[PDB]
Amino acid sequence: MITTKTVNGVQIAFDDQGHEPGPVFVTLSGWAHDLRAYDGMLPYLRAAQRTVRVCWRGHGPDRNLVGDFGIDEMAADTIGLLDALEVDSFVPIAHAHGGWAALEIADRLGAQRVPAVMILDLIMTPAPREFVAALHGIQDPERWKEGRDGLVQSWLAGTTNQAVLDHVRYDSGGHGFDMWARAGRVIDEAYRTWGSPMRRMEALAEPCAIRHVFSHPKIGEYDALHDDFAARHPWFSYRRLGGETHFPGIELPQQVAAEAIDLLAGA
Amino acid sequence: MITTKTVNGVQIAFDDQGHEPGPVFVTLSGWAHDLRAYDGMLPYLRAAQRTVRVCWRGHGPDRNLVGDFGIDEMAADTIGLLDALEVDSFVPIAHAHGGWAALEIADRLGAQRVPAVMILDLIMTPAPREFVAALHGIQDPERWKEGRDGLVQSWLAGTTNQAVLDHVRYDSGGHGFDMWARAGRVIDEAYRTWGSPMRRMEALAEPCAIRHVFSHPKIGEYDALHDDFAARHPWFSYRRLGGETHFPGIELPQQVAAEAIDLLAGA
Amino acid sequence: ITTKTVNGVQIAFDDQGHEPGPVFVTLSGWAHDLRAYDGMLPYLRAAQRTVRVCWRGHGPDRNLVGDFGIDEMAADTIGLLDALEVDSFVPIAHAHGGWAALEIADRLGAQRVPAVMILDLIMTPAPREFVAALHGIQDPERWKEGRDGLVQSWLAGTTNQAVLDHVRYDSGGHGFDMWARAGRVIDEAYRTWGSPMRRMEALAEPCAIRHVFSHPKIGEYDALHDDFAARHPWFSYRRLGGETHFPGIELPQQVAAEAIDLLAG
Ligand SMILES: CCCCCCCC(=O)Nc1ccccc1C(=O)O
């Protein structure tokens, strides 16, 4: 099933399924997990379009520690893989902070090559100070596991969804302080540089169609910030989903797949 | 599940299952797919004999581009693998144009080491002009994908066999122009060099038992050609199957495995 | 299946679970990999974090590795678990993987390795048919006969499906190099120590050790275990009602429970 290519001199794991014409779905996971984040959505995505599920460097089957990297590399690697696989136009689907690389990829290639982007459960406000507090705790060699269990318990929010539970408990092993510390750095730095992902989006040369789908962030006035953003910018849309967890693509695979297909159709 | 060894400086993916006295079944796929082309046959083959499924160079999990190669490397890599495992006598089961490499193996090693060869749906006549056109089309950098989609339509006809449809749609990703173009050159050169696989078989120093099992060229003069070849060559046998597709090992795995097992019994 | 380089060699593993306490660490026999524990894994990973470990040369990459024995098998596994930030752990080890589990326990002490579970390791000196296969599998000119003898001694005319499938279909991909090394290393352990029971008696600081088996289904064999357990309160044993030499595959629920009980103490 799982194939690899060397891109930018590092090993990128992926799989490539489907032959329908049109834009390719490219799945991009969050930090510390791999293309199994999209097992639930995959049957629906691959029926609709060629779907390429992409792993970050250091996240494939080879779990040796890699040279330090962040969002520039995640985007350079994913783009290099797609050129090698002769993927022309494509629609990134990106989980939480993988959204940052998805937007970097959209900015580098333009709206004809990347006509749309879906983001799942990415904090659109500036970084809350509780979050920044945990981003530092996972950079602590003696307490990073503490920070991880803390982030996870709030991601689960006491769900009973077996897909989400199994994925967190069982399907994201083999990472440790190196990768969790790096996630801390890269995320912490992304919010310090841009302020928030919405400000990153407004800095896009020619914004493609962007859709944020989420269930957690809040309740909430988080929503009015989206309405507000969506009213300012025709290319932005969004959809609160009513899941219990930070993992809408796993908790609600058909609905999220439906959203991606709709997003693609529109563009 | 899948293992790799370095043979002739390249990575050869394979898997090895079964423990039974006698010859070993060695599965060989066509161009641009891997050992999952024998997932359906494998239960029946491994119950009968030790079975080694072999990928070509560049077709394993590592999908980095490799240097140019043809039938000679395919044959030498496979032999090198089996020598590394100390497999003694074995029976290649080869899909379509993997059959050229199976005959070259049989020729190199002779009929005690390779007492029999099974080939699955390999055009035994000279290449039809419409096939030659397709082989040239997959060498065109701008239209290779059209050439492929045309071939696939041929191969599926109107099937609703899910094993075959899933194999072609979903289980054969991760290849592009480098490999499809190479298949075109190599298959084209083979028909121009030998005229046809049947002429190739007649050039064998000491022919082993060779069986051709096929569904596709429609019934008619193709079967008469096979009747004539089998009347001239007692070491040759053939079976037309009732399938719709170019993939008898995937569409009719039980029946093709029984044919292999019967071939081996008789040699 | 994931890999890491440890001590210059590729160690394949997988890592599942997050419950606190000691980590389960599975160790397969010669010529097998993690699949030896597919059946117990659902039970183990629900109870504790579980790391299934392959020996060097036994993972997906089947290129030949530097010659090695128990010492390297122990050090590669320790090195992996350190890279995975595993602290205390309870090895579960099939047959002659048990020698490496005992070495790991010896090296690390009874706090980091509070218990070891071994699945069907002949606790007497080896029987003559087995010893003859250990020797034949080392002989360049007859090793395949040695391997067939070894495989026949594993199977013992059983009819259980999971175990037939495991032995027949999950031990491929090895050649003379690794099959001869198994014979060499197993025979060397019996030559060095006499028996696994003598090896355990040599432990600096015996942890709890439980032997789980269905075969050697005699009377003299349970006597041996009774005598040894009378002499040694850290030793326990459970004879299950299976027919095969692979309790973790034949009776995965019952083995996993014995492991979970073992860990509890
Ligand atoms: C992406 C789905 C592809 C499935 C690959 C199966 C390969 C195969 O069966 N045949 C050929 C491949 C290249 C050129 C000619 C042929 C021919 O069989 O005539």
Coordinates of C-alpha atoms and ligand atoms in Angstrom, one line a residue, chain A residues 19, chain B residues 30-33 95-97 121 131 135 138 148 151-152 155 167-168 172 180 183-184 187 246-247, ligand 1:
Chain A
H19 CA -8.2 8.1 -11.7
Chain B
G30 CA 3.0 -6.7 -15.7
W31 CA 4.4 -3.2 -16.1
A32 CA 3.3 -0.5 -13.7
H33 CA 1.8 -2.7 -11.0
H95 CA 1.0 -11.3 -16.1
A96 CA 0.9 -10.0 -19.7
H97 CA 4.1 -8.4 -20.7
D121 CA -3.2 -12.8 -21.1
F131 CA -1.6 -1.8 -29.8
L135 CA 2.7 1.7 -27.0
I138 CA 2.5 6.2 -23.6
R148 CA -3.1 4.7 -20.5
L151 CA -5.6 0.8 -22.6
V152 CA -7.5 0.5 -19.3
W155 CA -8.7 -4.1 -20.4
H167 CA -7.0 -3.0 -8.7
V168 CA -6.8 -0.7 -11.7
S172 CA -1.8 0.8 -9.1
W180 CA 4.7 4.0 -18.6
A183 CA 6.9 -0.1 -20.7
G184 CA 6.0 1.2 -24.2
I187 CA 7.2 -3.9 -25.1
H246 CA -7.3 -8.5 -19.4
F247 CA -6.6 -9.6 -15.7
Ligands
LIG1 C1 -2.8 2.4 -13.6 C2 -3.5 1.0 -13.9 C3 -2.5 0.2 -14.6 C4 -2.5 -1.3 -14.3 C5 -1.2 -1.9 -14.8 C6 -1.3 -3.3 -15.4 C7 -0.2 -3.5 -16.4 C8 -0.8 -4.4 -17.6 O1 -1.5 -5.3 -17.3 N1 -0.4 -4.3 -19.0 C9 0.3 -3.2 -19.7 C10 1.2 -2.0 -19.2 C11 1.8 -1.2 -20.0 C12 1.6 -1.3 -21.5 C13 0.9 -2.3 -22.0 C14 0.2 -3.3 -21.0 C15 -0.6 -4.4 -21.5 O2 -1.0 -5.3 -20.6 O3 -0.9 -4.5 -22.7

